[PDB]
Design a protein around this nucleic acid. Structure first.
Lengths: 125, 50, 282, 174, 78, 60
RNA sequence: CAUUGGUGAGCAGCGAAGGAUUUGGUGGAUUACUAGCUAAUAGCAAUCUAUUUCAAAGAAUUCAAACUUGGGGGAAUGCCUUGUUGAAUAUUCUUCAAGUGUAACCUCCUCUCAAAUCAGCGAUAUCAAACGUACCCCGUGAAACACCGGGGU
RNA sequence: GUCGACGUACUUCAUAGGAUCAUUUCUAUAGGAAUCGUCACUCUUUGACUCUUCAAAAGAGCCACUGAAUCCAACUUGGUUGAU
RNA sequence: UGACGGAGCCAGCGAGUCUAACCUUGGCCGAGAGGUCUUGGUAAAAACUCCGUCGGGGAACGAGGAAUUCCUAGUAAGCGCAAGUCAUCAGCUUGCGUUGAUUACGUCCCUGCCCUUUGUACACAC
């Protein structure tokens, strides 16, 4: 079959399953494209790993994300994690890893939640 | 009690052939045979002739 | 962690079933110790088996705090957590502070949008001794569950007669010293069990002249607890009440933690029973 | 291109046939006799053939009763005794102190019949002849063999006590 | 042990590596012929108990605070 | 009990940080809790693929 | 609609007198190359024998050694050690005992797993058929809105 | 009140006899069957060898030379008067 | 921080052959019991996004005094859903999700509460 790679994202009770395969440069979430994210103010939070990396690095990859659980804010944060993990897991497997290293550095210089999700764990004093 | 004690590192050698749905629960075929998952073109050509 | 707590709970529960089989052999080995010293008759079944006869040459070198608390009985000071049920009212927010104030080495963290698996994972993380969560009924409190954390026993109580310190006056401030404990009229096997499930909630070794006393009265199948301060006068000790009066009675005692709700019920209150009204601790 | 987990070839001690102890590699229901009721065994008719053991012989000498006309008093019908070759071999294996009872046993009026056993046990032969035929009547005076023949139906047993014999399972006691 | 990425192909016979063959018996003496090698002596207390050759590793490195150097505690020493 | 020896010898099994290749290793009662599969391995990928759980950012 | 499942029919594109897999055998490396043999300061390599024997050197644990034993209990016959009769100018064999002596011997443990598969019992279910209900049609019949049979939904 | 005694109640204590095996012959009995220098054939049992299934995991790795299969592309032959 | 409708889509805990009203008007059948039909009365995901239409109460009461209480991060607060666990709870209780902040995170100045005032626990320092 075609090359593929699969990552996971996690906010409070919302999970994201993103599959990244070689293709025509199309971006899909739940069948719908990315220009139809319903919270409508957080739509720039899911374009956010797209525009930090430059749109040329998504021109030949495909992204298909399912999301279940959570609400609205927790769902959008799951999509931006799974896209950013899905891009950086494709590039560590079939593309240059120095490309992966510059892709990873461009995310952790911005924000750590795009790569791994900090579990907001309780603490007793 | 078996759910809480899964030990998520087990391997039994049927993890290849047995598949799971995307929701999480496992799937089993209606035919159940290990040979009638689909049909080849030589079988389909003969069966449509019959 | 999660494998470790699953591993040591397996080794503990097998060791519980091992001494269950060993209790007959320990009882039989008592007879060998008596008969070798005083009393020449040896019974019939112990007379034949030469395996036990060669067993005693080793087993002559053998010889109560509860076994879940045996390691941590006095080697460490118990840090404990008081929590509310869910979306607390103002009254038990005051009352959880008073339970935290009655209990040395206690903290009070509010519970809101937590889940009980994630709470007990957090107290197994940071390391605490036991948790006291409180339910209520329109202000006044009704339930109080004490659950010891390293897969220790939990004990759920029901409390009715609650009068608290914030209701009456501006009486001052509580003592907050390491308190003396007064335990009275506990006689049953569950009585000694409920002593050790609750005595370990205080710090080890209070002072010789500690100035507050917390009594636990068993007068009539209700463990009734009050807190008092005292002096020693020239002719008689005077006492004065402070802190919450309780009329508390346990209704279940599961061997697992409070997270489980399917664990081994060591004891449960039975009330639809012909002899339920007859006696106590049943 | 070796295999993995190579182990030295040794003796498969529960498996091989070169040992002595691993050299090991039709329902049967015996019908009841067709001449037997629930408990009758209607084929018991005169004349009768008694099976005799030593405890019958030695007690009859002790109680002053000769066999052939002594059998006449209790069973009351015509009967001739027969002694197996196994029994008379072990009866005369008692030795010198019962040779007068030996002499009363060997007699032209006491019939004799042959045997086929790799042994000399009186109790095992008498039971096996009884099981295969349910035809004979048995004379016995010890509780071990008496309980063994009381547990098979339709087999009349007799013993001795007091001054004469006594039959147990016969319907025609008089 | 781990000095080479590419092991030599003239050391595997049709069974067993040639240098893994226990060659202590060909020695003429007694004390080195004595094998007290325990089965699970991975980083034990001696070297006669090892039954293998020691593995190479470095386990603690610190820079020198004075003279532009750094010292690494190795299998070969320091 | 034999297929474990096959997986240990092929270099799949670790005790904490390091994998051990000698199958004659006595594991301590305390140390029994920590024996997992090694990372980035095909012995772990099949295990997670049945569960549909493969997070290949950690290249598991 | 997705198939991130298989099997087949093609196209775009890649495309210098073919191209994909898959595999046996051999050779060279996989540590840094001073040549073969022998009785070796030399000879042979087409050989060391009708030249390879003599001489010289060469003897302490004065008559020394399991540093290599699964554990418990013994050890009759064994074996070891120490005391008990007879050959010779202080002495080889042998008379019999004692060993909290013994790697010869003789017993018990050194196996029965907090473990898995396999078989029986089978639930969650699932596929096909039959049967039952309702509504239509057809067959037999002279006929009975058929009591007789069949088909369909 | 921890026990004593008495009373009472419960539980427990002996089974015999025959046969076989176990001493590198002989378990002690003469009431029992086994002393041979193999030739072949048949039938099962067990193990090894080479592949292989449940089902993969891992390749003492690189390069060169010279061969064996399989599917295409192309060529030939047969084929609608009938190929699979 | 409104009202009116119209779309957009997001949850998790739940599932014992167990799940769940009352009163009344009649008709027919029945020997009754009652059955069948008839009729009327009484009680019983949100948030958010977006699209358009909109611009004082029938005496007490227009966001609540003094005085007090609680609270530090997935917290306070807001929102719904589910269950009713041998105690307690339906005038409610307990769970489970969605949204998710401000402000300290220092100090012993005040109020308290406790400890210490031979360093004895082995060096150096003090």
């Amino acid at each position: 079959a075609v090359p593929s790679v699969q990552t996971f994202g996690k906010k409070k009770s919302a999970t994201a399953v993103a599959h990244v395969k070689a293709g025509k440069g199309l971006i899909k979430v739940n069948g719908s494209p990315i220009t139809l994210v319903e919270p409508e103010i957080l739509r720039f939070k899911v374009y956010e790993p797209l525009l930090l990396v430059g749109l040329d690095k998504f021109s030949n990859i495909d992204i298909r994300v399912r999301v279940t659980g959570g609400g609205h804010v927790s769902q959008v944060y799951a999509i931006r994690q799974a896209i950013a993990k899905g891009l950086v897991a494709y590039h560590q497997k079939y593309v240059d890893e120095q490309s992966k290293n510059e892709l990873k550095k461009a995310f952790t210089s911005y924000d750590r939640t795009l790569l791994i999700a900090d579990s907001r764990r309780p603490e007793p004093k | 009690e078996k759910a809480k004690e899964r030990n998520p590192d087990e391997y039994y050698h049927a993890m290849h052939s047995r598949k799971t749905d995307a929701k999480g629960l496992l799937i089993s075929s209606r035919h159940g045979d290990e040979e009638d998952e689909s049909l080849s073109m030589d079988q389909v050509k003969l069966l449509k002739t019959q | 962690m999660l494998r470790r707590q699953a591993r040591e709970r397996r080794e503990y529960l097998y060791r519980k079933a091992q001494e269950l089989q060993d209790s007959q052999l320990q009882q039989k080995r008592q007879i060998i110790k008596q008969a070798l010293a005083q009393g020449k008759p040896l019974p019939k079944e112990l007379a034949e088996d030469e395996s036990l006869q060669k067993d005693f040459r080793y087993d002559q070198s053998l010889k109560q705090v509860d076994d879940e608390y045996a390691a941590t009985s006095g080697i460490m000071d118990p840090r404990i957590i008081v929590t509310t049920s869910r979306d607390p009212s103002t009254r038990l927010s005051q009352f959880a502070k008073e339970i935290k104030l009655l209990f040395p080495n206690a903290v009070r963290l509010n519970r809101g949008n937590y889940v009980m698996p994630n709470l007990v994972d957090a107290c197994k993380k940071s390391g605490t001794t036991d948790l006291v969560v409180l339910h209520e009924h329109r202000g006044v409190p009704t339930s109080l569950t004490i659950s010891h954390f390293p897969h220790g026993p939990t004990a759920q109580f029901s409390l009715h007669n609650v009068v608290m310190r914030h209701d009456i006056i501006n009486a001052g401030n509580q003592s907050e010293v390491n308190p003396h404990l007064i335990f009275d009229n506990f006689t049953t096997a569950l009585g000694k069990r409920v002593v050790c499930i609750l005595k370990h909630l205080f710090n080890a070794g209070p002072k010789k002249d500690s100035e507050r006393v917390i009594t636990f009265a068993n007068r009539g199948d209700f463990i009734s607890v009050r807190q008092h301060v005292y002096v020693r006068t020239r002719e008689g000790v005077e006492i004065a009440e402070v802190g919450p009066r309780f009329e508390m009675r346990l209704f279940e005692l599961r061997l697992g933690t409070l997270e489980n709700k399917d664990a081994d019920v060591e004891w449960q209150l039975r009330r639809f029973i012909r002899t339920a009204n007859k006696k106590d601790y049943l | 291109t070796r295999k993995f987990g190579l182990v030295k070839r040794t003796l498969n001690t529960k498996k091989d046939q070169r040992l002595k102890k691993n050299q090991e590699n039709t329902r049967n229901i015996p019908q009841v006799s067709s001449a037997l009721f629930f408990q009758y065994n209607q084929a018991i008719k005169p004349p009768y053939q008694v099976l005799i053991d030593t405890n019958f012989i030695n007690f009859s000498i002790q109680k002053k009763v000769d066999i052939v006309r002594g059998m006449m008093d209790c069973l009351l019908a015509k009967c001739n005794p027969l002694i197996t070759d196994c029994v008379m071999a072990e009866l005369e294996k008692l030795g010198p102190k019962y040779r007068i009872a030996l002499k009363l046993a060997r007699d032209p009026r006491i019939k004799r019949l042959s045997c086929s056993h790799k042994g000399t046990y009186a109790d095992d032969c008498l039971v096996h002849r009884v099981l295969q035929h349910k035809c004979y009547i048995v004379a016995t005076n010890d509780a071990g063999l008496k309980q063994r023949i009381r547990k098979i139906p339709g087999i009349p047993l007799m013993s001795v006590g007091g001054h004469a014999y006594v039959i147990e399972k016969l319907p025609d006691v008089f | 042990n781990g000095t080479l990425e590419f092991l030599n192909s003239k050391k595997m016979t049709e069974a067993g590596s040639l240098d893994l063959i226990d060659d202590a018996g060909e020695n003429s003496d007694l004390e080195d012929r004595i094998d007290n090698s325990l089965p699970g002596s991975q980083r034990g207390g001696d070297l006669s108990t090892r039954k293998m050759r020691p593995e190479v590793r470095v386990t603690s490195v610190q820079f020198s605070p004075t003279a532009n150097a750094f010292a690494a505690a190795s299998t070969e020493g320091l | 009990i034999q297929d474990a020896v096959k997986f240990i010898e092929q270099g799949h099994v670790r005790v904490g940080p390091n994998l051990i290749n000698d199958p004659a290793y006595l594991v301590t009662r305390n140390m029994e809790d920590y024996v997992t599969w090694v990372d980035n391995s095909k012995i772990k990928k099949t295990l997670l693929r049945y569960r549909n759980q493969i997070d290949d950012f950690d290249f598991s």
